[PDB]
């Protein structure tokens, strides 16, 4: 047989030399199994050694893949060339600054994640006492929301984040919600200030595209609305404490 070739448009940028990003074009051989990740590797190996990008796992579990394919945020390792025979344009992950080629500044993402204290709080139990008790029912409360691989596709997806870079964002809020709903955790109060902030849940207008593009089906949109409900309760209780 003979492998079919595909012309791929990769949006290059080198801050030492370029004043703005600019498209380049590479013919890449492919078959039904070939991923955008495979193709990026082929390019670097044979066409442009200076093509920089993030990746590692190759199986859509680490989250370093994140990038725009035809204005849709996707993971390179779960994007396949067979599906783009009419053309394929690859850009750096949207709503993040472009540092170099397909590598973006993820700092705000990490800082948002850190801010919401994503760890068990206020549980005095020690290991000599054995584990906590937690039923399937209790785990079902937060479990889906614990599946976030921090790929940041939901940030590229959210136009509110595009319009407001201080918005702590879907994944960050989702993680706060994940611990807030963990029966083992007692630090809900330690996380609300952020969630109650205008840059917290209240920057969300429920566009819902974060859940759409989420490769691990976390449904962060649902975590935010539940967050809005929880923030509202917290507002009411706060009004009624003249203490």
């Amino acid at each position: 047989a003979e492998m079919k070739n595909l012309k791929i448009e990769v949006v290059r940028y080198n801050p030492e030399v370029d004043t703005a990003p600019h498209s380049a074009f590479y013919e890449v051989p492919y078959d039904a199994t070939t991923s955008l990740l495979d193709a990026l590797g082929y390019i670097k190996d044979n066409l442009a050694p200076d093509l920089s990008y993030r990746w590692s796992c190759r199986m859509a579990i680490c989250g370093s893949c994140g990038m725009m394919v035809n204005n849709v945020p996707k993971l390179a390792c779960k994007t396949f060339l067979r599906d783009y025979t009419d053309g394929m344009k690859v850009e750096a992950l949207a709503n993040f600054p472009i540092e170099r080629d397909l590598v973006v500044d993820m700092t705000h993402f990490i800082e948002s994640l850190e801010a919401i204290k994503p760890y068990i709080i206020g549980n005095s139990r020690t290991a000599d006492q054995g584990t906590n008790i937690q039923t399937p029912a209790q785990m079902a409360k937060y479990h889906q929301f614990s599946g976030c691989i921090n790929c940041g596709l939901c940030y590229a997806a959210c136009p509110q984040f595009g319009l407001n870079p201080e918005f702590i964002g879907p994944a960050a809020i989702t993680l706060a919600h994940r611990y807030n709903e963990d029966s083992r955790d007692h630090g809900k109060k330690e996380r609300m200030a952020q969630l109650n902030s205008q840059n917290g849940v209240w920057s969300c207008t429920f566009v819902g595209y974060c859940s759409e593009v989420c490769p691990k089906h976390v449904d962060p949109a649902a975590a935010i609305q539940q967050g809005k409900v929880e923030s509202s309760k917290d507002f009411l209780i706060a009004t009624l404490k003249p203490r």
Binding site: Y13, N71, P97, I98, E99, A140, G208, E212, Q225, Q226
Partner: protein
């Protein structure tokens, strides 16, 4: 000094035009306009009602312009769209576990529609039949 020059892509006011998913979001927000327009119509109808039979007749004539009719026909379509989309979204606020599994959202959606269907019948019955 750094050798980095972070390129920040701007976001235009036409961001929503590009992707049909963003378009349906904007169209949802769009439903607000007729809704507000309808609430306004009702205030006119309310005060035309208190000013007596004369004012009420002028209100009813307005409603059969019939450019207004087409606007109201559109208003109805918007309201039904708002309903369809509202019931798709409200379920996401509930975190309900049934038999060690997070429920939803179909069981809730169906219920909301059942209430809408009954309400419409109960109200149409009460308003017209007597």
């Amino acid at each position: 000094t750094t050798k980095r020059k972070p390129y920040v892509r701007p976001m235009t006011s036409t961001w929503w035009k590009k992707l049909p998913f963003y378009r349906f979001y904007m169209l949802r927000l769009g439903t607000a306009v007729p809704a507000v327009w309808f609430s306004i119509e009702l205030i006119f109808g309310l005060f035309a009602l208190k000013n007596g039979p004369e004012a009420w007749a002028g209100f009813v004539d307005f409603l059969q312009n019939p450019v207004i009719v087409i606007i109201n026909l559109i208003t109805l379509a918007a309201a039904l769209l708002h309903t369809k989309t509202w019931f798709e979204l409200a379920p996401k606020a509930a975190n309900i576990i049934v038999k060690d599994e997070k429920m939803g959202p179909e069981p809730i959606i169906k219920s909301l529609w059942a209430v809408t269907v009954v309400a419409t019948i109960v109200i149409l019955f009460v308003a017209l039949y007597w």
